[PDB]
RNA sequence: CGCGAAUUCGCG
RNA sequence: CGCGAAUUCGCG
RNA sequence: CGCGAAUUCGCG
RNA sequence: CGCGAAUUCGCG
């Protein structure tokens, strides 16, 4: 009877519960009425509903002060954070040990997709429902002005937190003219090494230190 | 009637704030106390929107795989001067002398209809209604019989096939990911020049990389 | 131009 | 293989 | 692309 | 066995 706990948080009822639960199923539960569909149309709704947000309480509506801002309201941690406060994780349907923070964050998203969809895709109405319990959450977001944190940053909190060390990004190349130049880094941390390229020394850095962070969530 | 009455005629809308309009046809050259740079970032999202919910709705195969290419489509620039066009709109566009390129374009495009939106006091139903209204068909259609995308190393095939009477070589740099999901990184080569392109192919890849090469050799 | 081929690329 | 493009060669 | 196969990997 | 991503070979 969760189906009809997880509404009443909402604040809507689904006139098609097959729907619903579509929306919080995992494809490996059922391979063939999973949240796929929905996730992608999830993404394109809830960007817009964030977006119209951001342009609207934001101090500065230049593209540079919007674009930083924008990236973390819709980053996956985010999308976690609002799933959180409907306890979401609690009403997925899949596999024992499969569930992520990754997966979380798409089940939200195909969430609001059903609503749309469910309410004869009623973009005013759904939309509404969102802020009635997220709004808050974004605006102070947005105030807060938190931000994504760089991968450099986030690649020296990984390698220090298991190693106690920091990488090292040495210099291995230059190619095009003053004009316009490469650069070719190589972030490494012990015995794992990848290329960064890019405009400016900084800029390739952080290419490789996003390689580098890949190569170390499998290891 | 004036340019923003035709227009608005063409577009099957009447703004009930002629400023607003304005705003979103304006380049940042022509006013930069006022243009339209807030109101293409909100043009984006919103168009993204009313074009991906009519992508999952009428594509055939609904599949996360197929519909990713389409929709990158869809909200391609290119594409979008194409819907663009039907209204003819880069003749509206408020920019000095000839800075104007097919990117300008797009921009204006996204731009307008979030003047729309937030003319019509933030009605995304309407507003997304009277845009189906006007490209609905069009989408369809490049939806339905599918895209045609560029022949990049054909066309570059001839470029250096002539501008130099040799073909260009392909080299692989490197592969990456789980065997199920491989990402390619090939480079293109050719006299002296070079470039590199990324995808899930050794194709698509030569296709990326073809890509830069070429708006690279136009530059020397 | 038409026919028949070689080579490269792409599409089906 | 078919089809299309580019370079090439041969015949008409 | 079509047909016939080999290999690696993910899913059922 | 079956579905999917990739890389090759033969035939058309």
């Known amino acids: 009877k969760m189906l009809e706990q997880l509404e009443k948080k909402l604040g809507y009822t689904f006139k098609d519960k097959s729907l619903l639960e579509k929306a919080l199923t995992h494809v490996s539960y059922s391979k063939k009425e999973h949240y796929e569909t929905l996730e992608f149309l999830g993404d394109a709704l809830v960007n817009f509903f964030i977006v119209d947000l951001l342009v609207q309480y934001s101090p500065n509506k230049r593209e540079g002060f919007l674009s930083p801002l924008k990236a973390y309201l819709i980053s ?40 749309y969809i469910d309410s004869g895709r009623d973009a005013n109405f759904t939309r509404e429902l969102f802020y009635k319990l997220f709004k808050e959450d974004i605006l102070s977001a947005i105030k807060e002005g938190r931000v994504k944190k760089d991968y450099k940053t986030i690649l020296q909190e990984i390698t220090q937190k298991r190693w106690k060390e920091r990488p090292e990004y040495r210099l291995i190349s230059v190619e095009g003219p003053h004009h316009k130049k490469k650069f070719i880094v190589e972030a490494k941390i012990k ?9 400016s020394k900084k800029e390739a850095e952080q290419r490789a230190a996003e390689e580098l962070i890949k190569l170390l969530e499998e290891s």
């Open 76 to 115: 996956e941690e985010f999308f976690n954070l609002l799933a959180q406060k409907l306890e979401l994780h609690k009403f997925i349907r899949i596999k024992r040990g499969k569930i992520n923070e990754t997966i979380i964050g798409d089940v939200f998203k195909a969430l609001w997709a059903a609503v």
């Open 191 to 199: 015995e794992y090494r990848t290329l960064g390229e890019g405009k």
